[model samples]
Target: KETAAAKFERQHMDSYCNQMMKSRNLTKDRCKPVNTFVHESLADVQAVCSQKNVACKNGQTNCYQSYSTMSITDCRETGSSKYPNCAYKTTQANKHIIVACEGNPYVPVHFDASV
Candidate 1:
């Protein structure tokens, strides 16, 4: 049975990782959200979230969920056909993060979608 902590981690962490891969930047031409609900929906919890080893967009999954929770943001796309001109919003909240830890120094090989 997945505990509450585990559930939260799986839900948000996956989102964080996905967002990272999909729209890690403003120029991605994909992410844009509403005025509110900007910073990712991390549910409302503060604790040691559990991380699951998930695969990446490619079969070669190299992503790793954090053993702890952290702050993250996600900007989603709204709409409007403006070539080279996109829309977006921000979400500021405390949430668990996902990352593609690699190499000797380990860094953001991919990034989290945000939970």
Candidate 2:
């Protein structure tokens, strides 16, 4: 696989990560809401190319440099008065992941493999 391939531009990574969470044994109710829902898929870990002008049209869902239990484990409970939303600090480590979509049926270019 090459370094990058455009898949969903935005608001698509959520489905990808949701699938990933389920594959990783994270129940839909157990997985925490990701800061960034990974709407658009990037091809490399360096996908977060610029923070100055993010290319998202729907706006950010919530992304952080590191993954947290509350972020990936208890996502469904997010924004609830009982669970409440979790806050995260911005990342400076250039944290990113690489992704690959088969058939290229109009998918987006993933910036990271895991993101």
Candidate 3:
């Protein structure tokens, strides 16, 4: 079974967006609808857990917002996308990211939003 940290990395940690959605299997079976990829190093993203503590979208207090802006790419599933043949449109930007952290090592487990 995939741990929270591992799942976060698998879903969000792509340095480059070129074909990442398909390569990561996020486009299989059904379109993922919307997803974001961070273009920063794993260590840097992991360090976000120690930044400003903030409330999660669900009202949890374990979320943290990055102190510095990060480069990211948002993948949106096109309206024409179909199951087993997913397609995505990419949009890139720089913004501060919020994520929820947990467990022993205290790392990002959930991507909340980008500001």
- The candidate that wins on TM-score is 3
Local distance difference test, each candidate: 0.43, 0.31, 0.89
Q: Give the lowest summed-lDDT range of ten residues in model 3.
A: 14-23
lDDT of 1 by residue, 85-113 (tens): 55544456665555444544333334534
Per-candidate alpha-carbon RMSD to the true structure: 11.6, 13.1, 1.4
Q: Model 1: residues >4 Å from true position, as ranges?
A: 1-25, 28-54
Error of 1 at 39 (Å): 11
Error of 1 at 86 (Å): 2.1
lDDT of 3 at 44: 92
User: Across residues 35-78, which tens digit of lDDT does each residue of candidate 2 receive?
Assistant: 23342223322233322223333344222222211111112323
Query: Using alpha carbons, what is the TM-score of model 1?
Result: 0.46
What does candidate 3's lDDT look like per residue over 8-86, in tens digits? 9999997633378778878766678889999999999999999999999999999999999999998887777777767
lDDT of 1 at 74: 54
- Reference-based TM-score of each model: 0.46, 0.25, 0.93
Which model, 2 or 3, shows the larger lDDT? 3
Q: Clash number for model 3?
A: 0
Candidate 1 vs candidate 2, lDDT winner: 1
